[PDB]
Design an enzyme around this catalytic site. Structure first.
Site, PDB file in Angstrom:
ATOM      1  N   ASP A  95      -4.855   0.026  15.509  1.00 56.81           N
ATOM      2  CA  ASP A  95      -4.877  -0.302  14.091  1.00 56.81           C
ATOM      3  C   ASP A  95      -6.358  -0.442  13.735  1.00 56.81           C
ATOM      4  OD1 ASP A  95      -4.609  -1.882  11.541  1.00 56.81           O
ATOM      5  OD2 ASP A  95      -2.566  -2.178  12.176  1.00 56.81           O
ATOM      6  N   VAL A 116      -5.661   5.964  13.022  1.00 59.15           N
ATOM      7  CA  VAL A 116      -5.328   7.229  13.644  1.00 59.15           C
ATOM      8  C   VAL A 116      -5.181   8.381  12.650  1.00 59.15           C
ATOM      9  CG1 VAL A 116      -4.017   5.861  15.321  1.00 59.15           C
ATOM     10  CG2 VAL A 116      -2.801   7.188  13.560  1.00 59.15           C
ATOM     11  N   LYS A 169       9.067   3.253  10.834  1.00 63.62           N
ATOM     12  CA  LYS A 169       9.246   2.541   9.579  1.00 63.62           C
ATOM     13  C   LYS A 169       9.912   3.573   8.643  1.00 63.62           C
ATOM     14  CE  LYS A 169       6.214   0.254   6.263  1.00 63.62           C
ATOM     15  NZ  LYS A 169       6.078  -1.052   6.955  1.00 63.62           N
ATOM     16  N   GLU A 201      14.055  -1.093   3.169  1.00 64.79           N
ATOM     17  CA  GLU A 201      13.465  -0.618   4.432  1.00 64.79           C
ATOM     18  C   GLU A 201      14.369  -0.803   5.652  1.00 64.79           C
ATOM     19  OE1 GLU A 201      10.661  -2.833   7.054  1.00 64.79           O
ATOM     20  OE2 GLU A 201       9.101  -1.668   6.055  1.00 64.79           O
TER      21      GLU A 201
HETATM   22  N1  LIG Z   1      -3.715   5.656  10.295  1.00 63.83           N
HETATM   23  C1  LIG Z   1      -3.461   4.388  10.671  1.00 63.83           C
HETATM   24  N2  LIG Z   1      -3.668   4.063  11.953  1.00 63.83           N
HETATM   25  C2  LIG Z   1      -3.449   2.831  12.331  1.00 63.83           C
HETATM   26  N3  LIG Z   1      -3.043   1.833  11.622  1.00 63.83           N
HETATM   27  C3  LIG Z   1      -2.832   2.168  10.327  1.00 63.83           C
HETATM   28  C4  LIG Z   1      -3.017   3.398   9.784  1.00 63.83           C
HETATM   29  N4  LIG Z   1      -2.738   3.406   8.411  1.00 63.83           N
HETATM   30  C5  LIG Z   1      -2.352   2.062   8.122  1.00 63.83           C
HETATM   31  N5  LIG Z   1      -2.406   1.307   9.308  1.00 63.83           N
HETATM   32  C6  LIG Z   1      -2.068  -0.133   9.514  1.00 63.83           C
HETATM   33  O1  LIG Z   1      -0.667  -0.307   9.213  1.00 63.83           O
HETATM   34  C7  LIG Z   1      -0.615  -1.769   9.195  1.00 63.83           C
HETATM   35  C8  LIG Z   1       0.587  -2.148   8.352  1.00 63.83           C
HETATM   36  S1  LIG Z   1       1.104  -3.867   8.497  1.00 63.83           S
HETATM   37  C9  LIG Z   1       1.620  -3.800  10.199  1.00 63.83           C
HETATM   38  C10 LIG Z   1       2.070  -5.137  10.795  1.00 63.83           C
HETATM   39  C11 LIG Z   1       2.161  -5.093  12.330  1.00 63.83           C
HETATM   40  N6  LIG Z   1       3.129  -4.085  12.737  1.00 63.83           N
HETATM   41  C12 LIG Z   1       2.496  -6.477  12.912  1.00 63.83           C
HETATM   42  O2  LIG Z   1       3.333  -6.547  13.836  1.00 63.83           O
HETATM   43  O3  LIG Z   1       1.916  -7.479  12.445  1.00 63.83           O
HETATM   44  C13 LIG Z   1      -1.926  -2.293   8.699  1.00 63.83           C
HETATM   45  O4  LIG Z   1      -2.532  -3.274   9.664  1.00 63.83           O
HETATM   46  C14 LIG Z   1      -2.718  -1.066   8.593  1.00 63.83           C
HETATM   47  O5  LIG Z   1      -4.157  -1.304   8.891  1.00 63.83           O
END
Ligand SMILES: Nc1ncnc2c1ncn2[C@@H]1O[C@H](CSCC[C@H](N)C(=O)O)[C@@H](O)[C@H]1O
Ligand SMILES: C[n+]1cn([C@@H]2O[C@H](CO)[C@@H](O)[C@H]2O)c2nc(N)[nH]c(=O)c21
Length: 291
Positions: A95, A116, A169, A201
């Protein structure tokens, strides 16, 4: 009070047997009732998904690549649960945001601070070789344009990483904001207890066999069905008190949680399924600091 007697809860989208016209007024209603409810929602779903793979013998020896893992507080519980069962797993959490420090200092968990893209997926695939990969995605950019981009990225995650299983998701664009048809991986649409009050969702769970990748087209008419099925579940079903459910909490979400937790393996032997579930729930809430 809103009482009812149920045999089992709707575990999958396909089981929802009714629908209601979406009332935009619901968007103003209270979305969450518990602290760290989002971490709880994620923990239950991923615990359910992972325990299933354990059952099929595909978890041991795998590398779980979790994209969109930050903060990832609940992930520490998941890691501990399988680690303590003797399952050997490597975790790679990626992330652009920072992870909860409780994830640091574990030889079995690698934290990566990177957003990513297709190019990066290629490089990690080259490096992860030849380990079997289990993909978990929770990325978030939203607009229908934002969603489509996320779903496109998620399909590329599967095509490039070529995982043995995946949890993605999944929330269908709303018909009123439809743009164009698109494809998603075929899989079971696992419903989520403790999701926000009116969230549509769910999590797409897939297990890959052979070298095949089956996709499914999603249309605006599918979008209308998703909206109405999810609205019925949220407005009507989740607001039910299952009085024939003998448990400390009889609200629908707890009844549903019970059915997910009963599939989890524990070292400790319990005399009843109820005993194991109360144990797991207690353990989970304590870890997340939920009363
Ligand atoms: N291309 C990418 N690569 C990695 N993370 C990404 C992304 N595009 C968005 N995100 C990440 O998707 C996340 C959504 S919130 C995710 C919550 C996490 N699963 C938990 O357990 O707390 C954000 O932290 C965001 O930075
Ligand atoms: C689950 N939900 C949230 N919104 C969001 O709430 C706002 C007010 O209605 C919408 O503008 C949208 O963001 C939904 N919009 C539609 N059309 N359909 C839904 O099922 C829905």
């Amino acid at each position: 009070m809103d009482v009812v007697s149920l045999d089992k809860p709707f575990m999958y989208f396909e089981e929802i047997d009714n629908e209601l016209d979406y009332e935009p007024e619901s968007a103003n209603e209270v979305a969450k009732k518990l602290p760290y409810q989002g971490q709880l929602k994620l923990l239950l779903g991923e615990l359910f998904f992972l325990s299933k793979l354990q059952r099929h013998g595909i978890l041991d020896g795998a590398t779980v690549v979790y994209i969109g893992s930050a903060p990832g507080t609940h992930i520490r519980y998941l890691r501990d649960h399988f680690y303590n069962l003797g399952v050997i797993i490597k975790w790679m959490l990626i992330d652009g945001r920072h992870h909860d420090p409780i994830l640091n200092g574990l030889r079995d968990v690698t934290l990566v601070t990177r957003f990513v893209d297709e190019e990066y997926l290629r490089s990690i695939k080259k490096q992860l070789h030849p380990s079997k990969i289990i993909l978990i995605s929770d990325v978030r950019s939203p607009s229908t344009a934002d969603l489509l981009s996320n779903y496109a990225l998620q399909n590329v995650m599967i095509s490039i990483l070529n995982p043995v299983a995946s949890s993605l998701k999944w929330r269908c664009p709303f018909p009123a904001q439809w743009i164009k048809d698109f494809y998603i991986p075929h899989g079971n649409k696992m419903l989520q207890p403790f999701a926000p009050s009116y969230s549509a969702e769910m999590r797409l769970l897939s297990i890959y066999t052979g070298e095949n990748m089956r996709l499914t087209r999603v249309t605006k008419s599918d979008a209308v069905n998703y909206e109405k099925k999810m609205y019925y579940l949220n407005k009507i079903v989740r607001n039910k008190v299952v009085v024939n459910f003998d448990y400390p909490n009889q609200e629908y979400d707890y009844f549903h949680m019970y059915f997910m937790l009963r599939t989890v393996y524990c070292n400790k032997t319990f005399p009843t399924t109820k005993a194991k579930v109360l144990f797991l729930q207690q353990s989970i809430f304590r870890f997340l600091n939920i009363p």
